[model samples]
Target: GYDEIEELKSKNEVLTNLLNKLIAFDKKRIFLYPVNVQLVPDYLNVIKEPMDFTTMKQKLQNFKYKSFQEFEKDVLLIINNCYTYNDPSTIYYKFAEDIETYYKKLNIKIQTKYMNIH
Candidate 1:
């Protein structure tokens, strides 16, 4: 669902105020820390597929004798038997690509809202 960015900005302001108030109550006395904030569009990946109904039904029937725990054990066994698909460098490259894509979309404008450090 598309929404106005102004609404998110206003909501973020309110939450930031609440967080500042809570931070004041804490006695950490911490020094200044660098913080980065950004607003970006959402992205998600999902699978869409059609399955064989008859084969699925047969599989379920074959599992009828197994209890919930046994079924869970079998699922875990299958998952544990799986192998990693990529090496460290390949994984790093893939992750870096995703992060770069996200960073490119991120936009932030910082401005002090309160007169004092409230």
Candidate 2:
């Protein structure tokens, strides 16, 4: 019965902070909204799955993640999806590249700390 009765708030707080930092880092806010299918018709065909900051936030607030690794994977998924759908030459690629770098560096330290506390 000691599975998950109380270890919820602090965990979500850490993830919330990390997500906030990533959102703030996105100055252009390109990933803030879902890709407009009408404006960019080719987007859906190119990207079989789509991810964005708002959807991630909603999922987090909904308490859908069971582990930090799940959260990390989604962040990484968002980054690589950009690379896959858009070539490296665009600003989309540039921002996703920078965010991925930042995410990697900060994530290593946070993951270690979180695991240590586990």
Candidate 3:
């Protein structure tokens, strides 16, 4: 139906903008991830360590692609899977939109700082 197709189209646009925001900071340090219990280490009380930008960059580098199109395809696939399995009543969609807005705000600050650095 038109309604379903429109929903998908809107989601596609949102995700595309998100990916563009991420790639915009390709040379900068930025952290972006979905919230989950697994993100917090079980031994945090003992190790008392945290992840840094360098580590994050290294991790992402492992999956580096030759072009934005390649990365876009991967992102779309992941988003599609999340939508397929998750309950429609869940707040995941709102959470994603909030994250995207947060990132956009941060990007403005980052760009300002970077401009001064060069």
Candidate 4:
């Protein structure tokens, strides 16, 4: 019965905190909410699985994520959606690039923090 490591570790404060830090990295608030459909009509067409900080916040609150990696993948999706839809020269892509770089380190920081506690 103890085989399900994946089913353990809900209510993770460290995981949630890093996500908030990533969200705060977007100073312009571009990634704070869902992309405006009126502004970018083709966005939905390009990104079938759109992701944003607020959506991630809600999912975190709702316990929709099953594991740390689940939350981590969703974080990647937000950045990837930008890279996929916008050119690298655009502000959207540039901002995503910065966030992506920060996320990598924070994941390691968070996991190491978690391990030390366990």
Best by lDDT: 2
Ranking by lDDT: 2, 4, 3, 1
Error of 3 at 74 (Å): 1.9
lDDT of 3 by residue, 1-115 (tens): 9875554444444434555565454333222332233754442343223332233334344534333344334444333433443455766444434444555565455434323
Report each candidate's C-alpha RMSD, comma-separated, in the order given: 22.5, 1.7, 15.6, 3.5
Question: What is the lDDT, from 0 to 100, of the residue 27 in candidate 4?
Answer: 89
Determine the C-alpha RMSD for candidate 4 after optimal superposition of all C-alphas.
3.5
TM-score of 2: 0.90
Give the TM-score comparing model 1 with the true structure, all chains together: 0.23
**Segments in model 1 whose C-alpha atoms lie over 4 Å from true places:** 1-3, 29-118
Per-prediction backbone clash count: 0, 0, 0, 0
Tens-digit lDDT track of model 1 for 30-113: 211211113212211111221122322344444431222332232222222211222446543354344334323421211233
Ranking by TM-score: 2, 4, 3, 1
Best by TM-score: 2
Error of 3 at 110 (Å): 16
Supply candidate 2's per-residue lDDT for 56: 90
Model 1 worst lDDT window (10 residues): 40-49
Q: Is candidate 3 or candidate 4 better by TM-score?
A: 4
In model 4, the clashing pairs are none
lDDT measured at residue 88 in model 1 versus the true structure, 0 to 100: 43
Please report, as a residue range, the 10-residue window in candidate 2 with the lowest summed lDDT: 1-10
